[PDB]
Amino acid sequence: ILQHPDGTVLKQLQPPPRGPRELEFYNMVYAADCFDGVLLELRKYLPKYYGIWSPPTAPNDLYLKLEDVTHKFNKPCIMDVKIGQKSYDPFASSEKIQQQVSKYPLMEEIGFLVLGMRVYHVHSDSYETENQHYGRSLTKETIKDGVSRFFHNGYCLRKDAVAASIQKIEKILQWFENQKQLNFYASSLLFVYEGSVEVRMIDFAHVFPSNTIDEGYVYGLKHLISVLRSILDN
Template sequence: MEPVSSSIIDTAPPLPPDTQPLEHQIAGHFHGRSESKYGLLEQKSTGFVLKPFISAPRGPREHQFYVDVFSIHAPVEIQNLRPFLPTFFGLYEFAGMQYLTLENILKDFQRPCIADVKIGRITYDSEASTEKKQKLKNNFPAAVDLGFQLCGWKTYRSTQKKYIYHHKQCARSIKKHEISSALANFFGAPESDHHPVVRDVIIRLRTLERVMSDLRGFTFLATSLLIVYDGAQHQSCTQSMPKVDVRLVDFAHVSTVNDENGNPINQPDDNFIFGLRSYIDHLETIADDKFIYLPLERLNHNDPSNASSNCYTTFM
C-alpha cells in the first residue's frame, strides 16, 4: 500500500482505536497541528509509539532503516546501533494509513525530561529543492558552525512541581554564545545541579561516537538525538543518580552512499560525527565547574498573557 501523501488537510485524521496523541512529544509533526495533521501517537494499552508514514520516499526509507538495523542478518557495525534506537515492532495499519510501531523511550521515566537535538551542519538531502535548502539553513544559521540545533526541550522543575517546555521557535531564537546555557537549562540549571546528569549523558554519547565512527557508508541527515533524564529524582541535595537515556530518532533522510562502482563507500558520516562531537564538547563545557550560566530570561514562559508563544508551563 502507498503511504498517504502529505497534502494539506484541515481536520485531524481519525485516531486509531486505543490511541492518543503522544504525551511529552517536543518536536516534529504533532497530531492535528502539523500541516498534514498527522503526528505521532501512542497506543494506550501497550504504550507503543505509532509514527505515521506521511509520504514517499521519507516514510518507506525510515521503515527500511529500522528493518535493516533489527534484521538478524545485520552486520555487527549496524547491530551496534540497536541500543541507541527505539526498538521497532513492525507496521500497524488503520484507515488507509501505515504507522511504524516503536518502543516509547520514555516509558520507564517518572517525570521524563527530554530534548530533541538535530545533528549535522547540513540537515537537507540532495533531493531537497533550493527553496527547501535555504529554508532549512535559515531556521538556525548557527547550525553550520555548531553542527547541531535544538528542536525543543522540556524540563521538570521538581522544586516547583512544574514542567517547562520550549518549542522549536523558541529554541531557534538562541544565539550561538547562549547555546551552552540553553543546554544547561534543559539539564536543570540554574535551580538544580546539572553536573551529574550531564556527565552520565557524555559517557553514553562517547559510546555512540565510537559506534558511529565504525559505521561506514551511511549518511544521517536530520536525524535527532533524544536526550532523556528523570526529573523526579533531580534534586541537588541527593546523591542518587537520575535515570538517563540517549537515543536516535527520525531516519526519514538516512541513506547509503555508494562509490562509482555501486559499492558502499568506506567512510563514516563526517557531517553527523562533527555535530555529535560538537554537542559533546558543549556538554563538557557545562560539566566543568568553571561554567557560568547565562540567564535566558526571554525563554521564561510563565506569563500566561504571552499568547504568541506555544511554549508552556504545566503544573503536576
C-alpha cells in the same frame, strides 16, 4: 507521536518520500536475517522496532511501532536535538536546500539544533516546555546556556545527567567512527533523564547509503560533547 500505555509510541509515516524512507531504514536495520555487525551494533542506540502497524479497519494509515524511550521514567525530562551540519539531504533541490538552511543558518557552524525540551520542575511540580523557536534563536554566544536549561532540575544543575549524557553520546560517536555505510540528515538525539539517562537516535526520514564517514554528524556530536563538558564546570 502517539504514546501507547503498553510502553510504545506510534509514529505516523510522514508523506512520501520521507515516511517510506524511514520505514525502509527500520526494516533494513532490524532485518531478521541481518548479520551486519555495524547494523547489529546500531540497534542498541535506536528505539526497539516492532514493525509497521496500521489500524484494523484502515490499512491505508501507516505507522511505525517503536519503543517509548521515556516509558521507564516517572517524571521524564526530555530534549530533542537535531544533529549534523546539513539538514538537507544529497538529493535536495536548490530551493529545498535554501529552505532547510533558512530554518536555522547556524547549523553548519554549530552542528546541532535543539528542537525542544520538556523539563520537570520539582519546586512547582510542573513542566517547562520550549518549542522549535527556542533552539532556532540560539547562537554561539547563547548555546551553552541554551542547553544548560534542560538540566535545571531538583534545586540544582543536574551535572549527573550531564556527565551521563556525555558518556552515552560517546558510545554513539564510537559507532559513527566505525561505520561508513550510512549518512544521517535531519535526524535527532532524544535525551531523557529522571526529574522526580537515555540518549537515543530517532527520526530517520533522511538516512542514505554512503561510502564515507558521516563527518557532519561526527562534528555535531563532538561539539555537543564539548558544550556538555563545559557545563560540568558551572
